[PDB]
Design an enzyme around this catalytic site. Structure first.
Site, mmCIF file in Angstrom:
data_model
loop_
_atom_site.group_PDB
_atom_site.id
_atom_site.type_symbol
_atom_site.label_atom_id
_atom_site.label_comp_id
_atom_site.label_asym_id
_atom_site.label_seq_id
_atom_site.Cartn_x
_atom_site.Cartn_y
_atom_site.Cartn_z
ATOM 1 N N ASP A 121 -27.982 -4.981 5.851
ATOM 2 C CA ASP A 121 -28.119 -4.074 4.836
ATOM 3 C C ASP A 121 -29.525 -3.253 5.164
ATOM 4 N N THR A 159 -26.115 0.300 -1.427
ATOM 5 C CA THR A 159 -25.268 -0.661 -0.710
ATOM 6 C C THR A 159 -23.571 -0.907 -0.971
ATOM 7 N N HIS A 265 -37.621 -2.811 0.917
ATOM 8 C CA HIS A 265 -37.931 -2.389 -0.521
ATOM 9 C C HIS A 265 -39.361 -2.752 -0.655
ATOM 10 N N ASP A 683 -10.942 25.305 -5.882
ATOM 11 C CA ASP A 683 -11.042 23.906 -5.903
ATOM 12 C C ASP A 683 -11.527 23.600 -7.438
ATOM 13 N N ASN A 685 -10.506 21.783 -9.837
ATOM 14 C CA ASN A 685 -10.325 20.324 -10.415
ATOM 15 C C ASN A 685 -11.300 19.480 -9.560
ATOM 16 N N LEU A 689 -9.464 19.155 -2.597
ATOM 17 C CA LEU A 689 -8.016 19.451 -2.141
ATOM 18 C C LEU A 689 -7.721 20.921 -2.733
ATOM 19 N N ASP A 691 -6.102 23.960 -4.341
ATOM 20 C CA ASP A 691 -5.598 24.016 -5.671
ATOM 21 C C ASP A 691 -4.038 24.757 -5.344
HETATM 22 C C1 LIG Z 1 -9.505 10.822 0.601
HETATM 23 O O1 LIG Z 1 -8.186 9.720 0.802
HETATM 24 C C2 LIG Z 1 -7.284 9.403 -0.338
HETATM 25 C C3 LIG Z 1 -6.396 8.464 -0.120
HETATM 26 O O2 LIG Z 1 -5.211 8.952 0.913
HETATM 27 C C4 LIG Z 1 -6.861 10.666 -1.157
HETATM 28 O O3 LIG Z 1 -6.498 9.959 -2.467
HETATM 29 C C5 LIG Z 1 -5.195 10.343 -2.873
HETATM 30 O O4 LIG Z 1 -4.816 11.380 -3.309
HETATM 31 C C6 LIG Z 1 -3.671 11.689 -3.760
HETATM 32 C C7 LIG Z 1 -3.890 13.117 -4.720
HETATM 33 O O5 LIG Z 1 -4.910 13.176 -5.399
HETATM 34 C C8 LIG Z 1 -3.315 10.685 -4.833
HETATM 35 O O6 LIG Z 1 -1.809 10.848 -5.061
HETATM 36 C C9 LIG Z 1 -1.563 10.501 -6.456
HETATM 37 O O7 LIG Z 1 -1.103 9.288 -6.722
HETATM 38 C C10 LIG Z 1 -0.835 8.796 -8.038
HETATM 39 C C11 LIG Z 1 -0.255 7.277 -7.888
HETATM 40 O O8 LIG Z 1 -1.809 6.726 -7.915
HETATM 41 C C12 LIG Z 1 -1.779 5.213 -7.835
HETATM 42 O O9 LIG Z 1 -1.377 4.582 -6.685
HETATM 43 C C13 LIG Z 1 -2.044 4.741 -5.430
HETATM 44 C C14 LIG Z 1 -1.334 3.798 -4.348
HETATM 45 O O10 LIG Z 1 -1.397 2.389 -4.644
HETATM 46 C C15 LIG Z 1 -3.502 4.178 -5.792
HETATM 47 O O11 LIG Z 1 -4.277 4.315 -4.494
HETATM 48 C C16 LIG Z 1 -4.092 4.813 -6.679
HETATM 49 O O12 LIG Z 1 -5.420 4.462 -6.980
HETATM 50 C C17 LIG Z 1 -6.225 5.457 -7.588
HETATM 51 O O13 LIG Z 1 -6.304 5.070 -9.124
HETATM 52 C C18 LIG Z 1 -7.017 3.961 -9.608
HETATM 53 C C19 LIG Z 1 -6.864 4.128 -11.066
HETATM 54 O O14 LIG Z 1 -7.468 5.206 -11.609
HETATM 55 C C20 LIG Z 1 -8.264 3.628 -8.934
HETATM 56 O O15 LIG Z 1 -8.587 2.093 -9.011
HETATM 57 C C21 LIG Z 1 -8.202 4.143 -7.533
HETATM 58 O O16 LIG Z 1 -9.728 3.863 -7.052
HETATM 59 C C22 LIG Z 1 -7.893 5.304 -7.216
HETATM 60 O O17 LIG Z 1 -8.564 6.412 -7.913
HETATM 61 C C23 LIG Z 1 -8.843 7.667 -7.103
HETATM 62 O O18 LIG Z 1 -7.701 8.465 -7.193
HETATM 63 C C24 LIG Z 1 -7.121 8.900 -8.630
HETATM 64 C C25 LIG Z 1 -5.767 9.618 -8.294
HETATM 65 O O19 LIG Z 1 -4.868 8.739 -8.140
HETATM 66 C C26 LIG Z 1 -8.341 9.627 -9.236
HETATM 67 O O20 LIG Z 1 -7.933 10.023 -10.498
HETATM 68 C C27 LIG Z 1 -9.664 8.751 -9.393
HETATM 69 O O21 LIG Z 1 -10.362 9.842 -10.049
HETATM 70 C C28 LIG Z 1 -10.067 8.421 -7.977
HETATM 71 O O22 LIG Z 1 -10.590 9.387 -7.100
HETATM 72 C C29 LIG Z 1 -3.133 4.763 -7.939
HETATM 73 O O23 LIG Z 1 -3.395 3.562 -8.603
HETATM 74 C C30 LIG Z 1 0.517 9.768 -8.346
HETATM 75 O O24 LIG Z 1 0.860 9.454 -9.860
HETATM 76 C C31 LIG Z 1 -0.007 11.172 -8.281
HETATM 77 O O25 LIG Z 1 1.236 11.995 -8.609
HETATM 78 C C32 LIG Z 1 0.912 13.086 -9.611
HETATM 79 O O26 LIG Z 1 0.746 14.323 -8.976
HETATM 80 C C33 LIG Z 1 1.798 14.692 -8.143
HETATM 81 C C34 LIG Z 1 1.326 15.870 -7.354
HETATM 82 O O27 LIG Z 1 2.108 15.681 -6.063
HETATM 83 C C35 LIG Z 1 3.311 14.911 -9.064
HETATM 84 O O28 LIG Z 1 4.277 15.209 -8.014
HETATM 85 C C36 LIG Z 1 3.424 13.732 -9.745
HETATM 86 O O29 LIG Z 1 4.433 13.960 -10.620
HETATM 87 C C37 LIG Z 1 2.152 13.199 -10.675
HETATM 88 O O30 LIG Z 1 2.047 14.096 -11.751
HETATM 89 C C38 LIG Z 1 2.037 13.407 -12.917
HETATM 90 O O31 LIG Z 1 0.941 12.921 -13.081
HETATM 91 C C39 LIG Z 1 -0.343 13.716 -13.771
HETATM 92 C C40 LIG Z 1 -1.621 13.117 -13.663
HETATM 93 O O32 LIG Z 1 -1.529 12.343 -14.850
HETATM 94 C C41 LIG Z 1 0.099 14.837 -14.777
HETATM 95 O O33 LIG Z 1 -0.894 15.686 -14.823
HETATM 96 C C42 LIG Z 1 1.467 15.334 -14.658
HETATM 97 O O34 LIG Z 1 1.866 16.187 -15.841
HETATM 98 C C43 LIG Z 1 2.631 14.237 -14.311
HETATM 99 O O35 LIG Z 1 2.970 13.057 -15.086
HETATM 100 C C44 LIG Z 1 -0.372 11.429 -6.813
HETATM 101 O O36 LIG Z 1 0.511 11.360 -5.909
HETATM 102 C C45 LIG Z 1 -3.605 9.100 -4.612
HETATM 103 O O37 LIG Z 1 -3.388 8.025 -5.342
HETATM 104 C C46 LIG Z 1 -5.089 9.119 -3.865
HETATM 105 N N1 LIG Z 1 -5.291 7.711 -3.604
HETATM 106 C C47 LIG Z 1 -6.592 7.003 -3.700
HETATM 107 C C48 LIG Z 1 -6.650 5.829 -3.018
HETATM 108 O O38 LIG Z 1 -7.616 7.532 -4.288
HETATM 109 C C49 LIG Z 1 -8.128 11.676 -1.356
HETATM 110 O O39 LIG Z 1 -7.433 13.028 -1.589
HETATM 111 C C50 LIG Z 1 -8.868 12.023 -0.148
HETATM 112 N N2 LIG Z 1 -9.990 12.992 -0.229
HETATM 113 C C51 LIG Z 1 -9.874 14.138 0.457
HETATM 114 C C52 LIG Z 1 -11.035 14.701 -0.201
HETATM 115 O O40 LIG Z 1 -9.165 14.458 1.289
HETATM 116 CA CA LIG Z 2 -8.102 21.031 -6.047
HETATM 117 ZN ZN LIG Z 3 -31.800 -1.804 -0.681
#
Ligand SMILES: *[C@@H]1O[C@H](CO)[C@@H](O[C@@H]2O[C@H](CO)[C@@H](O[C@@H]3O[C@H](CO[C@H]4O[C@H](CO)[C@@H](O)[C@H](O[C@H]5O[C@H](CO)[C@@H](O)[C@H](O)[C@@H]5O[C@H]5O[C@H](CO)[C@@H](O)[C@H](O)[C@@H]5O)[C@@H]4O)[C@@H](O)[C@H](O[C@H]4O[C@H](CO)[C@@H](O)[C@H](O)[C@@H]4O[C@H]4O[C@H](CO)[C@@H](O)[C@H](O)[C@@H]4O)[C@@H]3O)[C@H](O)[C@H]2NC(C)=O)[C@H](O)[C@H]1NC(C)=O
Ligand SMILES: [Ca+2]
Ligand SMILES: [Zn+2]
Ligand SMILES: CC(C)(C)c1cc(S(C)(=O)=O)cc(-c2ccc(Cl)cc2)n1
Ligand SMILES: [Cl-]
Ligand code: NA
Ligand code: NA
Length: 806
Positions: A121, A159, A265, A683, A685, A689, A691
């Protein structure tokens, strides 16, 4: 409730944690106040210390001792780590000459080389050179293994966000640990380093390495350690686990040290008090390696020595107070320190207004040591916006400083000399990477890389398929002797149309004008050839970008540039052009100042119109291929085509015009030509990624012309600058940016001055990886080079940082 009356007999540092109210004997039982009654007696023995001495050799086993020096200790797996040195005439590992490890040399029953991650760390990158005289074990790992001069942490450089990024390959906005302190408004719960909320699983997103391993049938040691367990006991515990029967023995292990952060620190990154913590860490590494050598594992295990973040000089007096800027300081909550996050103190307060808070914090004091941002306006390289736990208002704090709400917070809530948390490109925040073992290369230096890449490599080292993450798998293949990951380029999803001349000038009613009716078989064939792609090899040097989503677009060729024109977004997705070292800059001629020309290859219905810009009193336009860099007066007309036009606020045009008129030529001069690919980004939102069309929040007034949130450029040349960009035989060199498309220059406090005094500074702050642009556009670049694909993956992850030497 905990029934602490159970016992730790034969359970010390057990791997499967028991559930309440049964008492615990694992790594973390102290943190939960849940250890069984006899955990200290049985599991934390200290008697006689940590080292064999001559008089202990061949002793009668005393089970009370912290470690053993009796003849039976090797079969028990519990000798002191210096046993063979003291008692059996062996050498310390650090005293042995380095010898290449070409293949794993492992004991029978080992299915794979184990991986041990030794995390430190606050281990600033420059300690590797600066402290090398007092760290002989670490210096051997470094010189004999594979090392980077530094590794870049994630923002914020705290950290918990960085350890959990190491574990998951995810940005904090994605894994959800966006600070050491957080409020989640959906849970209505607060996370702190102190206390019990942090153990709740709902905070921790993604899939960390220990879970990835377990799901795929690879056993993991517990990665976490209660702070009170001394380091010597942590190492002895690891070593004991490595003696378990094959079916019980983990393949991956982690050690963590709270040093040198703890002392940093208190004393500052280079306080004279810092030498002793570095010596102690090196001693711990020696214990591990001597212990491995005793087990005949020192040419079997892969060791990663890795840090979370660096450490900067920060003292109490360098604190900016929001009470010197805001009238309403009691109506806000501030997460303070080396970054600021602001939200409303009360959701019932209808007089709270983020716009007036930002304006009050903007360029108010001449040497102001923080800058306010709405989170979507932060540099895209930070990837710090898409999470509800990240407050809308962010303060980026200058290195060496703190922000706080009121002075009483800093003397009633001055002692410390070091801190970290700043922008992850700052030199003092860089940390360390060394890999040593059969799977890593021998005496190899690799360029700096980001810690988001390490999860994929740790998966590679264990034969695991990584969960979806933000690393670019294969980009670190050059660190590895074997176990490389050989990906294939993604398939193109949309193929382009190649339109010819299909429309007459009079079919257009765009409200545009141009003085171009100023007018030869020789030269007319030649210009038809240019429209067909005859110069395309000079301007598209690495192939056409591939479009990885479904859309309708056209390739358009010109003497000086080539573009991929979206029929859906009414502008290019990308425009590619090469500028040689010898290129001349020219002006936009007087008669052409307001010139915009219909493109007879593209229908009126898929074109922008000039009338929308006339009517939109906030919006002007620029060009993606710059008219200033035309190869000839006649070629320059191509640059005013409506298909090369893009919407630009006048404030942004100041930036863009300087980039195009001055900086492109400067880079061509400095780099021996450059190839430039530029384009819009949408972008709205702020998820990093591309839009889709139905996510666009703003259009040029009255039209279907979408307004970009950002403009990018990828500037590529030959790494061997003795060769020109367009005749480069070997590796490439790249720098890129993603500039926010803002209607003011409030970000730049000096913007009233000449662009020579502020624009390049802005562009540096918004430096980017080609990979960041790929996410943001759905385009795949460098499709056609003569380079290895893994080499190109590394190129795409490069970030040009503009920091001086570490
Ligand atoms: C970095 O790498 C990561 C990993 O690959 C990329 O993140 C992925 O991006 C994808 C797109 O944004 C995203 O896919 C979505 O997944 C939804 C299901 O999600 C759950 O399941 C997965 C798998 O186990 C899990 O990992 C998720 O975990 C997230 O959420 C929990 C609770 O909030 C957190 O503990 C966790 O930290 C993580 O949060 C992060 O991601 C979420 C988004 O999921 C953000 O909101 C947070 O801020 C945070 O950043 C989940 O538990 C799935 O439901 C989505 O599908 C919707 O959209 C598609 C479009 O294809 C559509 O077809 C569907 O119908 C659906 O739409 C419906 O829902 C909409 C929203 O409610 C609504 O508007 C509509 O009208 C519909 O009803 C989507 O497929 C994927 O989950 C994340 N994974 C992770 C780990 O973050 C990231 O993009 C990379 N970054 C870069 C810059 O490249
Ligand atoms: Ca976007
Ligand atoms: Zn420190
Ligand atoms: C941040 C969490 C709580 C998940 C955490 C804690 C600890 S601790 C300080 O040792 O308890 C160690 C690690 C760790 C993560 C990734 C890696 Cl590769 C090695 C170690 N992570
Ligand atoms: Cl027209
Ligand atoms: Na206008
Ligand atoms: Na300004």
């Amino acid at each position: 409730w905990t029934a602490t009356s159970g016992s730790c007999k034969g359970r010390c540092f057990e791997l499967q944690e028991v559930g309440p109210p049964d008492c615990r004997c694992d790594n973390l039982c102290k943190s939960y106040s849940s250890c069984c009654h006899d955990f200290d007696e049985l599991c934390l023995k200290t008697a006689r210390g940590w080292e064999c001495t001559k008089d202990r050799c061949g002793e009668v086993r005393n089970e009370e001792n912290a470690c053993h020096c009796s003849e039976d200790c090797l079969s028990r797996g519990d000798c002191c780590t210096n046993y063979q040195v003291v008692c059996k005439g062996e050498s310390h590992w650090v005293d042995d000459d380095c010898e290449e490890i070409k293949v794993p040399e492992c004991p029978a029953g080992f299915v794979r080389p184990p991986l041990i991650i030794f995390s430190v760390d606050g281990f600033r990158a420059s300690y590797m050179k600066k402290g090398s005289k007092v760290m002989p074990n670490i210096e051997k790992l470094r010189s004999c293994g594979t090392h980077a001069p530094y590794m870049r942490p994630v923002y914020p450089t705290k950290t918990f966000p960085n350890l959990y990024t190491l574990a998951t390959g995810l940005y904090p906005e994605s894994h959800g640990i966006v600070g050491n302190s957080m409020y989640d408004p959906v849970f209505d719960a607060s996370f702190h380093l102190r206390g019990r909320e942090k153990f709740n699983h709902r905070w921790w997103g993604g899939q960390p390495l220990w879970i990835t391993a377990t799901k795929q049938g690879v056993r993991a040691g517990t990665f976490f350690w209660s702070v009170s367990i001394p380091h010597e006991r942590r190492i002895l515990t690891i070593l004991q686990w490595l003696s378990l029967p094959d079916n019980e023995r983990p393949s991956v292990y982690a050690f963590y040290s709270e040093q040198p952060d703890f002392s940093g620190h208190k004393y500052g990154p280079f306080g004279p008090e810092m030498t002793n913590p570095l010596r102690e860490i090196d001693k711990t590494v020696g214990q591990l390696m001597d212990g491995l050598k005793q087990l005949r594992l020192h040419r079997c295990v892969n060791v990663i020595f890795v840090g979370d973040h660096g450490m900067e000089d920060v003292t109490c007096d360098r604190t900016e107070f929001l009470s010197n800027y805001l009238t309403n300081v009691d109506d806000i909550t501030l997460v303070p320190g080396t970054l600021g996050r602001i939200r409303a103190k009360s959701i019932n307060n209808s007089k709270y207004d983020p716009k007036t808070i930002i304006a009050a914090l903007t360029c108010k004091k001449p040497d102001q040591h923080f800058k306010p941002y709405m989170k979507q306006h932060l540099p895209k390289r930070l990837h710090y916006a898409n999470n509800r736990r990240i407050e809308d208002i962010h303060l980026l704090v200058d290195r060496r400083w703190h922000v706080a709400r009121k002075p009483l917070d800093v003397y009633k809530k001055c002692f410390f000399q070091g801190d970290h948390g700043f922008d992850n490109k700052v030199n003092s925040m860089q940390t360390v990477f060394v890999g040593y073992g059969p799977t890593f290369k021998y005496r190899t230096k690799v360029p700096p890389f980001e810690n988001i890449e390490l999860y994929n490599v740790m998966c590679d080292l264990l034969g695991l398929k990584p969960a979806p993450n933000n690393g670019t798998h294969g980009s670190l293949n050059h660190l590895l002797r074997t176990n490389t990951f050989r990906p294939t380029m993604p398939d193109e999803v949309s193929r382009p149309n190649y339109p010819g001349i299909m429309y007459l000038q009079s079919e257009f009613d765009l409200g545009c004008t141009c003085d171009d009716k100023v007018e030869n078989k020789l030269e007319e064939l030649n210009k038809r050839l240019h429209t067909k792609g005859s110069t395309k090899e000079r301007h598209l040097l690495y192939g056409r970008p591939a479009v990885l989503y479904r859309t309708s677009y056209d390739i358009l060729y010109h003497t000086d540039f080539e573009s991929g024109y979206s029929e859906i977004f009414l502008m290019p997705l990308w425009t590619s052009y090469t500028i040689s070292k010898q290129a001349e800059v020219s002006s936009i001629p007087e008669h052409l100042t307001n010139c915009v020309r219909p493109d007879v290859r593209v229908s009126p219905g898929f074109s922008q119109n000039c009338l929308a810009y006339k009517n939109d009193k906030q919006m002007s336009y620029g060009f993606l291929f710059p008219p200033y860099l035309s190869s000839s007066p006649e070629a320059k007309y191509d640059a005013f085509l409506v298909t090369n036009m893009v919407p630009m606020y006048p404030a942004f045009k100041r930036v863009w015009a300087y980039f195009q008129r001055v900086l492109v030529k400067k880079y061509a001069s400095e780099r021996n030509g450059v190839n430039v690919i530029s384009g819009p980004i949408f972008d709205y939102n702020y998820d990093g990624l591309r839009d889709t069309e139905d996510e666009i929040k703003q259009y040029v007034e009255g039209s279907s012309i979408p307004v970009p949130t950002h403009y990018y450029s990828i500037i590529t040349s030959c790494l061997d600058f003795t060769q020109p960009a367009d005749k480069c035989d070997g590796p490439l060199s790249v720098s890129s940016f993603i500039l926010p498309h803002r209607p003011d220059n409030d970000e730049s406090c000096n913007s009233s001055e000449d662009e020579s005094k502020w624009v390049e500074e802005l562009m540096k702050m918004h430096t980017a990886r080609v990979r960041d642009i790929e996410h943001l556009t759905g385009l795949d670049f460098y499709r056609k080079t003569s380079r290895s694909y893994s080499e190109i993956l590394t190129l795409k992850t490069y970030l040009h940082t503009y920091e001086s030497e570490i």
